Enzyme design. Structure first.
Site, PDB file in Angstrom:
ATOM      1  N   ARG A 120       2.470   5.597  -7.567  1.00  0.00           N
ATOM      2  CA  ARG A 120       1.508   4.879  -8.369  1.00  0.00           C
ATOM      3  C   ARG A 120       0.084   5.367  -8.055  1.00  0.00           C
ATOM      4  NH1 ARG A 120       2.871   0.432 -11.089  1.00  0.00           N
ATOM      5  NH2 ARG A 120       1.408  -1.060 -10.159  1.00  0.00           N
ATOM      6  N   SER A 174     -15.914   9.988   4.939  1.00  0.00           N
ATOM      7  CA  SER A 174     -15.979   8.734   4.185  1.00  0.00           C
ATOM      8  C   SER A 174     -14.672   7.996   4.129  1.00  0.00           C
ATOM      9  CB  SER A 174     -16.572   8.963   2.792  1.00  0.00           C
ATOM     10  OG  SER A 174     -15.600   9.396   1.889  1.00  0.00           O
ATOM     11  N   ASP A 189     -10.700  -4.846  -5.961  1.00  0.00           N
ATOM     12  CA  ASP A 189     -10.101  -5.613  -7.052  1.00  0.00           C
ATOM     13  C   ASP A 189     -11.293  -6.071  -7.886  1.00  0.00           C
ATOM     14  OD1 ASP A 189      -9.083  -7.861  -8.449  1.00  0.00           O
ATOM     15  OD2 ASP A 189      -7.569  -8.053  -6.902  1.00  0.00           O
ATOM     16  N   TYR A 196      -3.516 -13.115  -1.302  1.00  0.00           N
ATOM     17  CA  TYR A 196      -3.852 -11.782  -1.818  1.00  0.00           C
ATOM     18  C   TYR A 196      -5.365 -11.696  -2.084  1.00  0.00           C
ATOM     19  CZ  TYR A 196      -4.829  -8.149  -5.190  1.00  0.00           C
ATOM     20  OH  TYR A 196      -5.410  -7.138  -5.844  1.00  0.00           O
TER      21      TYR A 196
HETATM   22  N1  LIG Z   1      -2.381  -1.666 -10.302  1.00  0.00           N
HETATM   23  C1  LIG Z   1      -3.487  -2.337 -10.642  1.00  0.00           C
HETATM   24  O1  LIG Z   1      -3.701  -2.542 -11.824  1.00  0.00           O
HETATM   25  C2  LIG Z   1      -4.473  -2.821  -9.586  1.00  0.00           C
HETATM   26  C3  LIG Z   1      -5.421  -3.804  -9.849  1.00  0.00           C
HETATM   27  C4  LIG Z   1      -6.316  -4.218  -8.868  1.00  0.00           C
HETATM   28  C5  LIG Z   1      -6.339  -3.626  -7.627  1.00  0.00           C
HETATM   29  N2  LIG Z   1      -5.451  -2.642  -7.388  1.00  0.00           N
HETATM   30  C6  LIG Z   1      -5.400  -2.065  -6.056  1.00  0.00           C
HETATM   31  O2  LIG Z   1      -5.278  -0.656  -6.101  1.00  0.00           O
HETATM   32  C7  LIG Z   1      -4.448  -0.244  -5.024  1.00  0.00           C
HETATM   33  C8  LIG Z   1      -3.273   0.500  -5.658  1.00  0.00           C
HETATM   34  O3  LIG Z   1      -2.533  -0.298  -6.605  1.00  0.00           O
HETATM   35  P1  LIG Z   1      -0.963  -0.067  -6.935  1.00  0.00           P
HETATM   36  O4  LIG Z   1      -0.585  -0.978  -8.086  1.00  0.00           O
HETATM   37  O5  LIG Z   1      -0.679   1.416  -6.998  1.00  0.00           O
HETATM   38  O6  LIG Z   1      -0.296  -0.677  -5.593  1.00  0.00           O
HETATM   39  P2  LIG Z   1       1.215  -1.085  -5.351  1.00  0.00           P
HETATM   40  O7  LIG Z   1       2.119  -0.164  -6.133  1.00  0.00           O
HETATM   41  O8  LIG Z   1       1.287  -2.546  -5.625  1.00  0.00           O
HETATM   42  O9  LIG Z   1       1.205  -0.789  -3.801  1.00  0.00           O
HETATM   43  C9  LIG Z   1       0.961   0.517  -3.283  1.00  0.00           C
HETATM   44  C10 LIG Z   1       1.835   0.716  -2.057  1.00  0.00           C
HETATM   45  O10 LIG Z   1       1.510  -0.271  -1.096  1.00  0.00           O
HETATM   46  C11 LIG Z   1       2.446  -0.116  -0.056  1.00  0.00           C
HETATM   47  N3  LIG Z   1       2.699  -1.301   0.784  1.00  0.00           N
HETATM   48  C12 LIG Z   1       3.047  -2.531   0.346  1.00  0.00           C
HETATM   49  N4  LIG Z   1       3.308  -3.330   1.402  1.00  0.00           N
HETATM   50  C13 LIG Z   1       3.180  -2.605   2.520  1.00  0.00           C
HETATM   51  C14 LIG Z   1       3.335  -2.894   3.946  1.00  0.00           C
HETATM   52  N5  LIG Z   1       3.683  -4.144   4.364  1.00  0.00           N
HETATM   53  N6  LIG Z   1       3.082  -1.914   4.803  1.00  0.00           N
HETATM   54  C15 LIG Z   1       2.723  -0.685   4.390  1.00  0.00           C
HETATM   55  N7  LIG Z   1       2.560  -0.358   3.083  1.00  0.00           N
HETATM   56  C16 LIG Z   1       2.772  -1.281   2.121  1.00  0.00           C
HETATM   57  C17 LIG Z   1       3.766   0.275  -0.771  1.00  0.00           C
HETATM   58  O11 LIG Z   1       4.373   1.396  -0.091  1.00  0.00           O
HETATM   59  P3  LIG Z   1       5.950   1.763  -0.272  1.00  0.00           P
HETATM   60  O12 LIG Z   1       6.246   1.883  -1.746  1.00  0.00           O
HETATM   61  O13 LIG Z   1       6.067   3.035   0.485  1.00  0.00           O
HETATM   62  O14 LIG Z   1       6.686   0.612   0.344  1.00  0.00           O
HETATM   63  C18 LIG Z   1       3.357   0.556  -2.234  1.00  0.00           C
HETATM   64  O15 LIG Z   1       3.857   1.749  -2.837  1.00  0.00           O
HETATM   65  C19 LIG Z   1      -3.998  -1.507  -4.264  1.00  0.00           C
HETATM   66  O16 LIG Z   1      -4.757  -1.741  -3.046  1.00  0.00           O
HETATM   67  C20 LIG Z   1      -4.195  -2.592  -5.277  1.00  0.00           C
HETATM   68  O17 LIG Z   1      -4.442  -3.833  -4.625  1.00  0.00           O
HETATM   69  C21 LIG Z   1      -4.515  -2.272  -8.328  1.00  0.00           C
HETATM   70  N1  LIG Z   2      -1.187  -4.056  -4.818  1.00  0.00           N
HETATM   71  C1  LIG Z   2      -1.356  -4.448  -6.079  1.00  0.00           C
HETATM   72  N2  LIG Z   2      -2.420  -5.168  -6.409  1.00  0.00           N
HETATM   73  C2  LIG Z   2      -2.638  -5.578  -7.667  1.00  0.00           C
HETATM   74  N3  LIG Z   2      -3.652  -6.348  -8.088  1.00  0.00           N
HETATM   75  C3  LIG Z   2      -3.511  -6.544  -9.402  1.00  0.00           C
HETATM   76  C4  LIG Z   2      -4.419  -7.306 -10.092  1.00  0.00           C
HETATM   77  C5  LIG Z   2      -5.013  -8.405  -9.454  1.00  0.00           C
HETATM   78  C6  LIG Z   2      -5.930  -9.243 -10.079  1.00  0.00           C
HETATM   79  C7  LIG Z   2      -6.290  -9.013 -11.398  1.00  0.00           C
HETATM   80  C8  LIG Z   2      -5.707  -7.931 -12.052  1.00  0.00           C
HETATM   81  C9  LIG Z   2      -4.794  -7.101 -11.410  1.00  0.00           C
HETATM   82  C10 LIG Z   2      -2.347  -5.917  -9.811  1.00  0.00           C
HETATM   83  C11 LIG Z   2      -1.947  -5.975 -11.124  1.00  0.00           C
HETATM   84  C12 LIG Z   2      -1.821  -4.866 -11.939  1.00  0.00           C
HETATM   85  C13 LIG Z   2      -1.510  -4.959 -13.310  1.00  0.00           C
HETATM   86  C14 LIG Z   2      -1.297  -6.212 -13.881  1.00  0.00           C
HETATM   87  C15 LIG Z   2      -1.414  -7.331 -13.078  1.00  0.00           C
HETATM   88  C16 LIG Z   2      -1.736  -7.204 -11.734  1.00  0.00           C
HETATM   89  C17 LIG Z   2      -1.800  -5.276  -8.711  1.00  0.00           C
HETATM   90  C18 LIG Z   2      -0.689  -4.534  -8.406  1.00  0.00           C
HETATM   91  O1  LIG Z   2       0.189  -4.191  -9.205  1.00  0.00           O
HETATM   92  N4  LIG Z   2      -0.470  -4.100  -7.096  1.00  0.00           N
END
Ligand SMILES: NC(=O)c1ccc[n+]([C@@H]2O[C@H](COP(=O)([O-])OP(=O)(O)OC[C@H]3O[C@@H](n4cnc5c(N)ncnc54)[C@H](OP(=O)(O)O)[C@@H]3O)[C@@H](O)[C@H]2O)c1
Ligand SMILES: Nc1nc2[nH]c(-c3ccccc3)c(-c3ccccc3)c2c(=O)[nH]1
Ligand SMILES: NC(=O)c1ccc[n+]([C@@H]2O[C@H](COP(=O)([O-])OP(=O)(O)OC[C@H]3O[C@@H](n4cnc5c(N)ncnc54)[C@H](OP(=O)(O)O)[C@@H]3O)[C@@H](O)[C@H]2O)c1
Ligand SMILES: NC(=O)c1ccc[n+]([C@@H]2O[C@H](COP(=O)([O-])OP(=O)(O)OC[C@H]3O[C@@H](n4cnc5c(N)ncnc54)[C@H](OP(=O)(O)O)[C@@H]3O)[C@@H](O)[C@H]2O)c1
Ligand SMILES: NC(=O)c1ccc[n+]([C@@H]2O[C@H](COP(=O)([O-])OP(=O)(O)OC[C@H]3O[C@@H](n4cnc5c(N)ncnc54)[C@H](OP(=O)(O)O)[C@@H]3O)[C@@H](O)[C@H]2O)c1
Ligand SMILES: Nc1nc2[nH]c(-c3ccccc3)c(-c3ccccc3)c2c(=O)[nH]1
Ligand SMILES: Nc1nc2[nH]c(-c3ccccc3)c(-c3ccccc3)c2c(=O)[nH]1
Ligand SMILES: Nc1nc2[nH]c(-c3ccccc3)c(-c3ccccc3)c2c(=O)[nH]1
Lengths: 249, 249, 249, 249
Positions: free
Chosen positions: A13, A136, A142, A155
């Site tokens: 991802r 860096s 978020d 969270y």
């Molecule tokens: N996706 C969104 O739309 C969104 C929105 C807001 C913020 N963000 C932030 O952007 C970053 C990336 O998002 P994402 O959706 O790609 O994240 P994700 O798929 O939800 O998580 C990324 C990775 O976190 C690792 N992880 C989870 N629990 C763990 C643990 N206990 N110890 C070590 N590693 C752990 C997992 O590794 P493994 O698969 O190897 O277990 C997973 O692949 C995150 O910090 C997320 O909070 C994302």
């Molecule tokens: N680690 C991790 N963090 C996440 N945070 C969000 C998220 C949180 C607040 C508002 C919108 C997205 C998401 C998120 C991503 C898409 C739709 C809803 C929530 C997300 C996620 O998939 N993985």
């Protein structure tokens, strides 16, 4: 020699996308993962096929516990062992699930959500700094941290703590020339446990194009912050959210 | 009959002033404490002398551990045991000391600073809510959270997490008619561990009066937020800082 | 065909660096100026000698008045007339001086400070939008907007309003594909005949390098925001401040 | 001797509620109004009946123009002429209407929305300070300022500037003993031009009771900030929004 970066939760991802874009920019990378071993090694294989000896993996649980500091120290050490330096840390790995106030115990929810989103970032930041060039750290924050999801209190508390870390570590590490910044997605790559109608619900909320960000768009902002064009930027969190955080209820 | 409030870390300084004001407004109070048993017992005695059996003491370490949830449930339980109800929770107790990034172990620092400032508040919040007219929670925050003290990363992280809890919990408990707010001191009662040249530097920084807040001024904002004059206020953090946070470097 | 940009207050200092840098990336530019006519024409000459027919000037007072809307329409027209298109608007022009609450009339101080920093940006935004690829607007904000300079209330009001424009226009123009963002300097090019004592004070307060930003470092964040690497970014303000805004009094 | 307050836009709705609660608290009041002359004298009559010679009206347009400073001066002077003193200024009067970026002229829109929400408050603040115990100013802000209404850019700019004024004036007037704070409603008294379909949509968004705030609820927060229980509070904006600002899209 090429600079090196640690990206946590980089097997898939958004973290994978960041590790790829860093690698394509010339970095050697440590692909940290927790459970996604096949995806991690598969990614390292591919990056090493492109440039030999430029990618390794490092497994660690980032749940809070009394050994988390040693685990975080080992992550950073694994970069020095592989590449002889550590220029960039990207704190990407994140537990994400609801924890209502009213399977897992609460002790475990606290340890996972606060450990992964905040405490491991802090300990990794400590180890990174102690082990020490455009150095860096980028924290994945978020954009919605002040309009949180219902029942996601731990969270959200983690992500707010991460903003605090970004600020406090920017301040403290500035004298060492280490910049500390964040990238704050809105909705980017959508959770796999989410149906199309839910995905369209979220997409429809984004003012700019009514779509989620690609992982690469989140990565672009990471690349900017670690680059030479951001050498005076520290303590800044760049939203990469298409305006989502601007939308009232 | 009379409402009841739990104040954490109420044996001295600001928590005491809050417990006393609540009591003078007609509340029955649980005086939580950790080490200050003499001051706590002594305070409940003074208050009970004013009004019979309107105060109880309750001791608990609010450091993060696997027993912390039980400890927090027992604090809320002690209010129900003594008064048959629990209308107000005040999250006041807080560890505060430097934790530089570069004789306690880091894991103890994490447990104390994040436990007291954030995790215990969440667990108390959970317990408070599960046991449930004007119900409310007041979290003691920090006006300087975006301009943190040098080398106080874990403390700042805790106080940021606490903002997040305040917002998340306001959102989630609104349907139960529980309001959740914060009061954010700038500089009030100055710590024992701080130097005199440093003490006076702080006072001179304050625009309004070039002095620190009294504990009582902090308490006045708590009284406002728990009152019927604050009935539509939830998710708000009132700074009580004499303008300190507005002052640039 | 090369894209075109309008840069307000582009004759000198930060606005010049932005114009130069956009021109270096391949943009044709309109150099707006108020009184710095010689510098503006000297810049245009230099950029045209570099690539022919890629620079013009436009003079205008951006003080608030009943003719301001037409002046702002003229500025945007001047880009279309020279270049046949207008892809980027950078709102950089700014009056900056103290306006204590206790030789100019107050009427003029309001007109100059609110006009340059807020209303002209708004009118320019309206003219830009109405005349419409990678379209964006970048507003030069202020990283210290919540910790203002003493006796600068109108300037600070202007810069707060500009935040509000940034957010409001991001939201409203997102459906058109027009992104709207901000760059917020701390201390950059230090104003002419500031004393060595004063400058040194400011420098020594900046965590990262104890030095002000170069105008080019401010320009680098502008370039990023207009770039295809910022395609999902709207309503974001990037501080470029060396951590200055994180430093308590 | 009874203190005196000026409340702008006090003929109706929230400013009325504020003037009434101030008077009930013991203040003499200047009821400023613009077009609502009958409402205003009707209120001064109702108050003067309760307490003789404790209410006057003062008509003024708070549109930006070159005579606005004279008008704001005369509002303040009207308090001194009637009551001998001026202790409290409440900046409540506000123009509110959409101003899309894409039959009032834009000139008029700018003058009315920026004038009423920002410049008149600045000029009233100036006059209040210069014409001089518990002196304070309360500004009626907007809890949704960072999540703006679509096409309300000028209104939103003005409310952001009012935040800036609150902060800047709090900083500068602190040495003079004048506190400056804000109250930020979410949804309160619903505009008279609105139909019960649209009203319910707004009500349904509010977590704390699915209802708009009462004018008295807003007024309650004003009364707290002017009171001796807020004597160390300056530069604070208290949201009174029922959690509305915490709800994502
Ligand atoms: N996706 C969104 O739309 C969104 C929105 C807001 C913020 N963000 C932030 O952007 C970053 C990336 O998002 P994402 O959706 O790609 O994240 P994700 O798929 O939800 O998580 C990324 C990775 O976190 C690792 N992880 C989870 N629990 C763990 C643990 N206990 N110890 C070590 N590693 C752990 C997992 O590794 P493994 O698969 O190897 O277990 C997973 O692949 C995150 O910090 C997320 O909070 C994302
Ligand atoms: N680690 C991790 N963090 C996440 N945070 C969000 C998220 C949180 C607040 C508002 C919108 C997205 C998401 C998120 C991503 C898409 C739709 C809803 C929530 C997300 C996620 O998939 N993985
Ligand atoms: N003083 C200020 O100027 C200021 C500035 C910003 C924010 N605040 C906040 O306002 C609140 C009150 O401030 P303060 O100066 O009165 O606080 P404090 O005296 O530093 O701490 C208050 C109490 O917290 C309790 N505490 C500490 N560690 C604990 C633990 N591990 N378990 C349980 N209790 C623990 C202590 O109880 P015992 O003594 O019983 O052990 C202590 O009396 C705090 O949350 C603080 O962060 C204060
Ligand atoms: N420098 C910093 O440290 C710093 C800090 C925070 C924010 N900023 C922001 O960054 C931007 C650039 O900073 P800067 O220091 O380069 O600005 P500046 O040199 O102070 O001013 C930029 C230009 O604004 C134009 N200007 C002033 N009054 C005007 C009017 N009435 N009409 C039209 N134009 C007018 C002037 O043009 P002429 O010269 O042609 O008359 C001037 O060259 C500004 O928006 C500033 O507020 C800068
Ligand atoms: N109502 C809400 O839900 C809400 C939400 C967010 C913020 N607020 C803020 O809280 C305050 C009160 O809200 P509200 O709904 O009571 O306000 P409002 O009814 O919309 O306006 C209050 C008064 O402002 C005065 N006003 C309008 N244009 C003026 C001008 N050009 N010169 C002088 N006065 C003028 C009017 O006086 P006359 O009738 O005498 O002409 C009017 O009665 C406002 O500042 C508002 O922005 C309210
Ligand atoms: N538990 C607890 N928390 C505290 N936080 C602060 C504080 C933090 C940042 C900026 C100013 C004060 C303080 C503090 C109090 C006075 C002077 C400096 C810091 C403080 C404290 O004494 N106890
Ligand atoms: N147009 C314009 N705006 C400016 N804003 C600032 C500034 C404002 C608040 C805090 C720091 C810098 C400055 C400024 C720049 C350097 C040192 C102090 C203030 C500045 C300027 O020179 N021109
Ligand atoms: N002067 C003035 N200002 C107002 N601001 C709002 C408002 C603005 C943003 C979000 C919610 C309400 C409102 C408003 C009030 C109720 C419903 C919608 C908007 C309002 C108003 O009626 N008068």
């Amino acid at each position: 020699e090429a600079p090196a970066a640690v990206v946590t939760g980089a097997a898939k991802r958004i973290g994978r996308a960041i590790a790829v874009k860093l690698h394509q920019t010339g970095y050697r990378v440590v692909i940290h993962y927790h459970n996604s071993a096949e995806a991690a090694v598969s990614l390292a294989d591919e990056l090493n096929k492109e440039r030999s000896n430029t990618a390794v993996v490092c497994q660690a649980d980032l749940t809070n516990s009394n050994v988390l500091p040693a685990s975080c120290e080992e992550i950073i050490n694994s970069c020095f062992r592989a590449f002889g330096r550590c220029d960039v840390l990207v704190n990407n790995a994140s537990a994400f699930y609801p924890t209502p106030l009213v399977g897992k115990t609460v002790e475990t929810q606290v340890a996972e959500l606060i450990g992964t989103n905040a405490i491991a970032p802090f300990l990794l930041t400590m180890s990174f700094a102690q082990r020490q060039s455009n150095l860096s750290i980028v924290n994945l924050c978020d954009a919605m941290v002040d309009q949180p999801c219902m029942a996601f209190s731990l969270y959200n508390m983690g992500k707010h703590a991460l903003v605090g870390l970004t600020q406090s570590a920017a301040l403290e590490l500035a004298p060492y020339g280490i910049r500390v910044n964040g990238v704050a997605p809105g909705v980017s790559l959508l959770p796999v446990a989410m149906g199309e109608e839910e995905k369209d619900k979220w997409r429809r909320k984004v003012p700019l194009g009514r779509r989620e960000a690609s992982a690469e768009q989140i990565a672009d902002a990471v690349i900017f912050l670690v680059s030479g064009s951001a050498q005076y930027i520290t303590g800044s969190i760049i939203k990469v959210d298409g305006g989502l955080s601007l939308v009232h209820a």
